[PDB]
Amino acid sequence: GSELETAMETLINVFHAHSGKEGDKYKLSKKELKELLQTELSGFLDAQKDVDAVDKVMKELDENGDGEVDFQEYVVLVAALTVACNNFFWENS
Protein backbone atom coordinates (compact mmCIF):
# COMPACT_ATOMS: atom_id res chain seq x y z
CA GLY A 1 0.00 0.00 0.00
CA SER A 2 3.05 2.25 -0.32
CA GLU A 3 3.42 4.91 -3.00
CA LEU A 4 6.98 3.77 -3.73
CA GLU A 5 5.98 0.26 -4.87
CA THR A 6 3.42 1.63 -7.34
CA ALA A 7 6.39 3.27 -9.03
CA MET A 8 7.73 0.15 -10.70
CA GLU A 9 4.21 -0.73 -11.88
CA THR A 10 4.19 2.31 -14.14
CA LEU A 11 7.52 1.43 -15.72
CA ILE A 12 6.16 -2.09 -16.23
CA ASN A 13 3.11 -0.62 -17.94
CA VAL A 14 5.22 0.99 -20.70
CA PHE A 15 8.06 -1.59 -20.59
CA HIS A 16 6.03 -4.73 -21.04
CA ALA A 17 3.80 -2.85 -23.49
CA HIS A 18 6.66 -2.97 -26.01
CA SER A 19 8.56 -5.97 -24.63
CA GLY A 20 9.48 -9.00 -26.68
CA LYS A 21 11.14 -7.12 -29.54
CA GLU A 22 14.41 -8.64 -28.30
CA GLY A 23 13.00 -12.15 -28.32
CA ASP A 24 12.24 -12.32 -24.60
CA LYS A 25 9.61 -10.16 -22.88
CA TYR A 26 11.48 -9.88 -19.57
CA LYS A 27 14.03 -8.05 -21.61
CA LEU A 28 14.19 -5.36 -24.24
CA SER A 29 16.85 -3.96 -26.53
CA LYS A 30 18.31 -0.58 -25.54
CA LYS A 31 17.05 1.06 -28.75
CA GLU A 32 13.42 0.11 -28.05
CA LEU A 33 13.53 1.87 -24.70
CA LYS A 34 14.78 5.07 -26.38
CA GLU A 35 11.77 4.93 -28.72
CA LEU A 36 9.01 4.16 -26.18
CA LEU A 37 10.41 6.75 -23.75
CA GLN A 38 9.99 9.59 -26.22
CA THR A 39 6.60 8.32 -27.37
CA GLU A 40 5.13 8.35 -23.85
CA LEU A 41 6.98 10.91 -21.80
CA SER A 42 8.09 13.72 -24.15
CA GLY A 43 8.63 15.93 -21.06
CA PHE A 44 11.67 14.92 -19.01
CA LEU A 45 13.83 15.24 -22.07
CA ASP A 46 13.46 19.02 -21.54
CA ALA A 47 13.97 18.59 -17.81
CA GLN A 48 17.54 17.31 -18.15
CA LYS A 49 19.97 19.89 -16.73
CA ASP A 50 23.10 17.73 -16.55
CA VAL A 51 24.09 18.02 -20.21
CA ASP A 52 27.26 15.98 -19.70
CA ALA A 53 25.31 13.06 -18.28
CA VAL A 54 22.72 12.98 -21.01
CA ASP A 55 25.22 13.56 -23.80
CA LYS A 56 27.22 10.53 -22.72
CA VAL A 57 24.04 8.46 -22.22
CA MET A 58 22.44 9.43 -25.54
CA LYS A 59 25.57 8.43 -27.42
CA GLU A 60 25.87 5.28 -25.28
CA LEU A 61 22.40 4.27 -26.31
CA ASP A 62 23.22 5.06 -29.94
CA GLU A 63 26.19 2.64 -29.94
CA ASN A 64 24.59 0.05 -27.68
CA GLY A 65 21.02 0.19 -28.94
CA ASP A 66 21.31 -3.17 -30.69
CA GLY A 67 22.29 -4.78 -27.40
CA GLU A 68 20.05 -6.02 -24.64
CA VAL A 69 18.83 -4.82 -21.24
CA ASP A 70 16.08 -5.65 -18.70
CA PHE A 71 13.60 -3.85 -16.44
CA GLN A 72 16.34 -3.15 -13.89
CA GLU A 73 18.49 -1.42 -16.50
CA TYR A 74 15.39 0.38 -17.82
CA VAL A 75 14.60 1.83 -14.41
CA VAL A 76 18.20 3.13 -14.18
CA LEU A 77 17.84 4.71 -17.61
CA VAL A 78 14.82 6.72 -16.44
CA ALA A 79 16.60 7.55 -13.17
CA ALA A 80 19.41 9.08 -15.27
CA LEU A 81 16.85 11.73 -16.18
CA THR A 82 16.02 12.31 -12.52
CA VAL A 83 19.60 12.92 -11.47
CA ALA A 84 20.10 15.27 -14.41
CA CYS A 85 17.00 17.24 -13.36
CA ASN A 86 17.01 17.21 -9.54
CA ASN A 87 20.48 16.07 -8.38
CA PHE A 88 21.71 18.98 -10.55
CA PHE A 89 21.94 21.12 -7.37
CA TRP A 90 25.14 19.15 -6.57
CA GLU A 91 26.83 22.31 -7.82
CA ASN A 92 25.98 25.96 -7.21
CA SER A 93 22.63 26.74 -8.83
Add this chain to the structure above:
Amino acid sequence: GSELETAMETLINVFHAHSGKEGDKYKLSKKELKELLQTELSGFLDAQKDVDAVDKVMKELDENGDGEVDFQEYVVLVAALTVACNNFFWENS
Protein backbone atom coordinates in the same frame (compact mmCIF):
# COMPACT_ATOMS: atom_id res chain seq x y z
CA GLY B 1 2.76 13.29 -18.94
CA SER B 2 3.37 9.55 -18.75
CA GLU B 3 2.71 7.51 -15.63
CA LEU B 4 6.30 6.29 -16.07
CA GLU B 5 7.56 9.76 -15.02
CA THR B 6 5.33 9.97 -11.93
CA ALA B 7 7.16 6.84 -10.84
CA MET B 8 10.40 8.51 -9.75
CA GLU B 9 8.41 11.11 -7.78
CA THR B 10 7.21 8.40 -5.41
CA LEU B 11 10.71 7.15 -4.73
CA ILE B 12 11.68 10.78 -4.11
CA ASN B 13 8.83 11.08 -1.60
CA VAL B 14 10.29 8.36 0.66
CA PHE B 15 13.95 8.93 -0.32
CA HIS B 16 14.14 12.62 0.29
CA ALA B 17 11.99 12.19 3.41
CA HIS B 18 14.92 10.37 5.00
CA SER B 19 17.70 12.09 3.03
CA GLY B 20 20.48 14.19 4.47
CA LYS B 21 21.72 11.58 6.94
CA GLU B 22 24.71 11.27 4.64
CA GLY B 23 25.79 14.80 4.37
CA ASP B 24 23.76 15.85 1.31
CA LYS B 25 20.08 16.02 0.30
CA TYR B 26 20.54 13.65 -2.67
CA LYS B 27 22.67 11.24 -0.70
CA LEU B 28 21.98 8.62 1.86
CA SER B 29 23.82 5.64 3.25
CA LYS B 30 22.87 2.13 2.14
CA LYS B 31 21.61 1.29 5.65
CA GLU B 32 18.95 4.03 5.59
CA LEU B 33 17.48 2.78 2.34
CA LYS B 34 17.20 -0.78 3.67
CA GLU B 35 15.42 0.57 6.75
CA LEU B 36 12.98 2.89 5.03
CA LEU B 37 12.18 0.29 2.38
CA GLN B 38 11.01 -2.31 4.88
CA THR B 39 9.16 0.29 6.96
CA GLU B 40 7.29 2.06 4.11
CA LEU B 41 6.55 -0.95 1.87
CA SER B 42 6.28 -4.14 3.98
CA GLY B 43 4.72 -6.00 1.00
CA PHE B 44 7.12 -6.65 -1.87
CA LEU B 45 9.49 -8.32 0.51
CA ASP B 46 7.16 -11.33 0.12
CA ALA B 47 6.92 -10.80 -3.60
CA GLN B 48 10.64 -11.57 -3.99
CA LYS B 49 10.97 -15.09 -5.43
CA ASP B 50 14.67 -15.07 -6.36
CA VAL B 51 16.42 -16.50 -3.29
CA ASP B 52 19.82 -16.27 -4.99
CA ALA B 53 19.39 -12.54 -5.56
CA VAL B 54 17.98 -11.60 -2.17
CA ASP B 55 20.59 -13.61 -0.31
CA LYS B 56 23.44 -11.78 -2.02
CA VAL B 57 21.90 -8.32 -1.85
CA MET B 58 20.69 -8.42 1.76
CA LYS B 59 24.15 -9.42 2.94
CA GLU B 60 25.75 -6.91 0.57
CA LEU B 61 23.68 -4.25 2.24
CA ASP B 62 24.53 -5.61 5.70
CA GLU B 63 28.27 -5.14 5.17
CA ASN B 64 28.02 -2.06 2.96
CA GLY B 65 25.27 -0.31 4.88
CA ASP B 66 27.79 2.17 6.26
CA GLY B 67 28.71 3.22 2.73
CA GLU B 68 27.00 5.79 0.64
CA VAL B 69 24.53 5.87 -2.24
CA ASP B 70 22.18 8.27 -4.09
CA PHE B 71 18.67 8.38 -5.60
CA GLN B 72 19.75 6.47 -8.72
CA GLU B 73 21.07 3.68 -6.50
CA TYR B 74 17.84 3.76 -4.50
CA VAL B 75 15.88 3.16 -7.68
CA VAL B 76 17.94 0.10 -8.63
CA LEU B 77 17.64 -1.23 -5.10
CA VAL B 78 13.85 -1.22 -5.45
CA ALA B 79 14.09 -2.82 -8.89
CA ALA B 80 15.98 -5.68 -7.24
CA LEU B 81 12.61 -6.58 -5.72
CA THR B 82 10.91 -6.37 -9.11
CA VAL B 83 13.29 -8.69 -10.92
CA ALA B 84 13.08 -11.18 -8.08
CA CYS B 85 9.29 -11.21 -8.59
CA ASN B 86 8.78 -10.87 -12.36
CA ASN B 87 12.03 -12.06 -13.99
CA PHE B 88 11.49 -15.19 -11.88
CA PHE B 89 10.08 -16.92 -15.00
CA TRP B 90 13.65 -17.28 -16.31
CA GLU B 91 13.37 -20.75 -14.83
CA ASN B 92 10.72 -23.37 -14.18
CA SER B 93 8.15 -21.58 -12.06
